[PDB]
Amino acid sequence: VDTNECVVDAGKVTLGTQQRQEMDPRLREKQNEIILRAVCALLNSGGGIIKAEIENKGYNYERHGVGLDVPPIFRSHLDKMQKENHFLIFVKSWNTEAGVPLATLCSNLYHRERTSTDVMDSQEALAFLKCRTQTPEGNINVSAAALFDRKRLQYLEKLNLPESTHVEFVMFSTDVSHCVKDRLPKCVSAFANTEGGYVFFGVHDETCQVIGCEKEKIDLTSLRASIDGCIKKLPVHHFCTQRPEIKYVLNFLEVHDKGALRGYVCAIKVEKFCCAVFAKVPSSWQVKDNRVRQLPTREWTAWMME
Ligand code: NA
Ligand SMILES: [Zn+2]
């Protein structure tokens, strides 16, 4: 995202509700993300102008609409204009809007309530950080503990353990390495930032039935390694002196059917964390040295703490 009085060039974009509906999805998402990062940078850099070349001929803003997906909190800071094949976005300074020091596309601080794991919005993130910085408790879920260390389950058995603040069920995807790399950071962030809990990979959430990953698609010792590497890779911010690593425990449960081993469930208990666990670096941006730049976790947190 090039900078060029702060003018940000977002490149070529397709415009219009219908036109963006029908366009290539990966390109649609890429353009929307370029625009949003440019918006976030300018909100955090005193405002500016985004310019973009409209690539679909015959585009007319008043009849066709825009078709970009923008967080509603950001919309009050934006104006938009079409001038022939060019599109302009007027971005006004964030200016401590909503009591949050800076604009953020995604805090990447997850939390869990009942059966739902969700990312914290900026105000939730701020309240969470303020609580964790000011701090200075029994079994988390014994039914889940009993399930966690079992050696074997029956294919398609329905578990009596329900999902809850402390229990999440997640399906494996076909590429289990991508499954863990994409989903586990959110689960670990959420459990560490909430009350701790257990995630069972290979259990279908809507039915609570044991599925497992086919044994031919799993190498146990390397999956255990990759889970450890995923968790060690998670950004954290401490307000404490001891600064412990995230604590977790992993067990592989065998899934049997018709008297043969068929697959595995991956059970992970994540302890409640002293401070903050991020699924990945917060998605917050600024203009710096004539470039759109993501804030490091430490800088984002420091700005958040005022
Ligand atoms: Na156990
Ligand atoms: Zn800590």
Numbering used by the authors: 7 to 10, 13 to 144, 165 to 334
From the paper:
The Schlafen family belongs to the interferon-stimulated genes and its members are involved in cell cycle regulation, T cell quiescence, inhibition of viral replication, DNA-repair and tRNA processing. Here, we present the cryo-EM structure of full-length human Schlafen 5 (SLFN5) and the high-resolution crystal structure of the highly conserved N-terminal core domain. SLFN5 binds tRNA as well as single- and double-stranded DNA, suggesting a potential role in transcriptional regulation. The N-terminal Slfn core domain (residues 1–336) is followed by a linker domain (residues 337–552) and a C-terminal helicase/ ATPase domain (residues 553–891).
